[PDB]
């Protein structure tokens, strides 16, 4: 975490920093997304 | 009219001998948008001038 990273989420690239998140999800929520089309969260396949 | 609207998604999908086409069609789309905006922005510049 906190660190300029390049990911691999199931083939969803990017690169950015990585911090827990405080706001609520749905339990079969898999991502979220801004207006600006942009991913907003991501969640860890092996670990919930 | 090109695949998706992500260009890490093209690259990841296709090969550099076609990535390039799909490219493309999305610089000369995205430099219409910003000639749209600066001219736009200078008009709008000359009446609070």
């Keep these: 975490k906190n660190?300029?990273?390049?990911?691999?989420?199931?083939?969803?690239?990017?690169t950015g920093v990585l911090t827990?998140?405080?706001?609520?999800?749905?339990?079969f929520q898999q991502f979220g997304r801004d207006i600006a089309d942009t991913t907003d969260a991501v969640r860890d396949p092996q670990t919930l | 009219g090109a695949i998706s609207s992500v260009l890490n998604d093209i690259l990841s999908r296709l090969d550099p001998p076609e990535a390039e086409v799909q490219i493309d069609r999305l610089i000369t789309?995205?430099?219409?948008?910003?000639q749209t905006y600066v001219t736009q922005q200078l008009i709008r510049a000359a009446e609070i001038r």
């Design chain 2, 29 to 34: 789309g995205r430099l219409q948008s910003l």
């Design chain 1, 3 to 14: 660190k300029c990273v390049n990911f691999n989420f199931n083939g969803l690239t990017g």
């Design chain 1, 20 to 27: 827990e998140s405080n706001k609520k999800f749905l339990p």
